[PDB]
């Protein structure tokens with residue numbers, strides 16, 4: 045998997061389960077074409093988002109539906125979602141893991157490229 | 159000022175200065191409409207982004223141009239920008255401070271909302 | 274004030290108020306000696322922690338009592354406190370703002386250091 | 389492994405390799421007894437810190453030697469180290485992963501209990 049997402053819950057101290065993750069790729073009209081999506085499993089990861097062949101260089105947006113996640117838990121959140129926008133770059137073998145640590149009024153996100 | 163943004167550089171341990179900040183508000187036809195924009199000063203915040211009258215209920219997006227920032231410092235960053243999208247003033251006016259802490263390959267953002 | 278601390282609650286989206294802050298400075302015999310202490314006000318910061326004269330070179334530890342905070346809000350937190358240990362004033366006096374963003378099972382801390 | 393540590397580098401966008409991780413357990417004199425240690429591997433994790441039998445309830449401190457890590461990279465850091473102090477609590481099956489995301493002037497840390 046060239047691209048993985050992992051979502052953690054900073055309130056419960058556990059992975060964020062059943063979170064909706066939508067990925068988009070920037071089109072020539074500068075519009076966001078749906079690219080991949082999924083919902084996080086018990087490990088806080090969605091399964092098999094894309095393939096080496098599809099994940100070409102390009103500007104991608106990963107949108108984590110945090111607001112539904114907090115609502116389910118009964119905690120009013122601040123954000124509509126968490127959005128991570130980045131250019132995928134070819135430069136040797138490289139797997140992308142986008143991690144997001146969620147709290148109701150904040151989130152942090154990092155990319156681990158390996 | 160009902161909407162303030164503060165941007166911090168976690169590499170340099172300082173406010174992130176000269177950072178472009180663009181704010182959009184979701185239009186009726188569901189597109190993002192320009193709402194406000196500024197650039198952070200030495201304190202890491204843009205000034206006078208909006209007014210209480212203009213900052214009505216809506217869904218807003220604060221886009222902080224982190225890529226141009228890291229690039230001016232000579233770093234090649236991961237993200238194109240940091241993006242903060244939220245519903246504002248849903249229970250009446252609040253004052254919102256969106257803070258973002260920036261690293262080349264990560265950022266964290268939190269909001270302090272006061273009545 | 275050459276040493277300031279700001280504490281934010283990432284659950285409530287507000288400053289963390291009534292939080293105890295203890296500062297220690299590493300003694301010659303290598304133990305941690307009490308240096309300063311306060312409690313955050315409504316802005317999430319304690320006030321007048323130290324003075325330029327007192328805040329000499331050394332290794333400091335800022336311990337923010339996050340556990341008692343989360344417990345007063347009725348949450349059972351992971352950490353006993355958040356701990357920020359750093360060398361201060363090594364290249365001459367600086368002003369230091371230690372910020373900490375708190376969640377029940379995580380926290381992040383950054384320092385803004387100005388000349 | 390009842391207790392795992394994972395260290396990420398927010399500047400390089402990769403795990404933090406060769407980082408020194410010391411774990412301590414609070415003694416009755418309120419002093420910190422060395423408990424476990426190791427250095428992070430290519431995955432940013434030290435290997436086999438402790439065992440189910442040793443990791444009893446108690447107050448633990450995990451100290452990540454961030455300052456040596458940044459020095460090696462040639463980046464002046466702020467912190468002497470990152471220190472994560474917590475009470476291990478028995479309450480059903482539970483593995484602790486202490487994650488830390490490091491930048492020169494900041495770090496965040498979260499516990500994933502699963």
Ligand SMILES: O=[N+]([O-])c1ccc(O)c([N+](=O)[O-])c1
Nearest residue numbers: 257259372373374381382383
């Ligand atoms: O200063 N801040 O607003 C701010 C933002 C994000 C953060 O993660 C932190 N922090 O680490 O304490 C502070």
Ligand SMILES: O=[N+]([O-])c1ccc(O)c([N+](=O)[O-])c1
Nearest residue numbers: 143152487488489496497498
């Ligand atoms: O491991 N992670 O994915 C991850 C992401 C962001 C974070 O801020 C942290 N953290 O606080 O240690 C960990």
